[PDB]
Amino acid sequence: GLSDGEWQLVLNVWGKVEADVAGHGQEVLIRLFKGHPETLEKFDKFKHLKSEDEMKASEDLKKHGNTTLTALGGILKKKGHHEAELTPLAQSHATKHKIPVKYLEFISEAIIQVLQSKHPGDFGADAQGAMSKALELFRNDMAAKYKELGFQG
Ligand code: HEM
């Protein structure tokens, strides 16, 4: 959905995340939990973290962040011919974890805020715009799969 050029920007900033997937993954879930505390409640092993000090110290949080970003990089690498990899994710999220589309917007924001915080240099006006279109396509495709399995509610 982006131009070839926009995908390139997207894969190029993602190259930075790939050099530290779990430290970027940890910081994204801390930003999401801190930003929207209600999301935390969706996680049984984190539901009890009461502060950012406890979130930073959690081994499990760091793992789950690695898991989350590893899965999103597999989707981003397919540029948009990503139906196959998105499916299973829409399936588990809609049906087993029961994650509203709204929360996919909250995590897209937490992603942009960590790339901006960790790579101010590299994540300039054009990289930010290309990653925001890429996360919006992701969330639109997830919403599409949700309304299909017949959720969104
Ligand atoms: C960038 C968007 C996301 C991606 C790529 C992603 C990826 C994953 C993956 C790969 C798993 C493990 C497999 C599965 O159970 O499907 C998972 C589990 C899970 N996800 Fe997500 N996720 C995303 C967003 C969210 C959001 C926004 C929430 C909640 C606010 C969430 C809640 C959960 C929960 C509750 C589980 C089960 C965790 C566990 O095993 O205890 N996910 N997610």
Our count of domains for the chain comes to 1
36 CA: nearest ligand 1 atom? 30
Per the CB < 8 A criterion, the answer to whether 2 and 10 are in contact is: yes
Ligand 1 pocket: which of 82, 97, 107 to mutate (most atoms <8 Å of CB)? 97
Q: How far is the CA of 68 from the centre of ligand 1 (A)?
A: 6
**Which residue, judged by its Cα, is nearest atom 3 of ligand 1?**
68
For residue 60, the domain's CATH number is 1.10.490.10
Per the CB < 8 A criterion, the answer to whether 83 and 141 are in contact is: yes
Query: What is the span of the domain harbouring residue 103?
Result: 1-153
Per the CB < 8 A criterion, the answer to whether 62 and 25 are in contact is: yes
Per the CB < 8 A criterion, the answer to whether 151 and 23 are in contact is: no
Q: Which of 98, 32, 106 is nearest to 64 (CA)?
A: 32
Per the CB < 8 A criterion, the answer to whether 13 and 127 are in contact is: yes
Q: Cα–Cα distance between 44 and 32 in angstroms, integer?
A: 16
- Sequence-distant (6+) residues with CB within 8 A of 2 are 10, 79, 80, 130, 133, 134, 137
- Method by which the coordinates were obtained: X-ray
Q: Is the CB of 39 under 6 A from ligand 1?
A: yes
3-state secondary structure of 78: coil
Structure's resolution in angstroms: 1.9
User: Helix crossing, 125-148 with 101-118: angle to 10°?
Assistant: 160
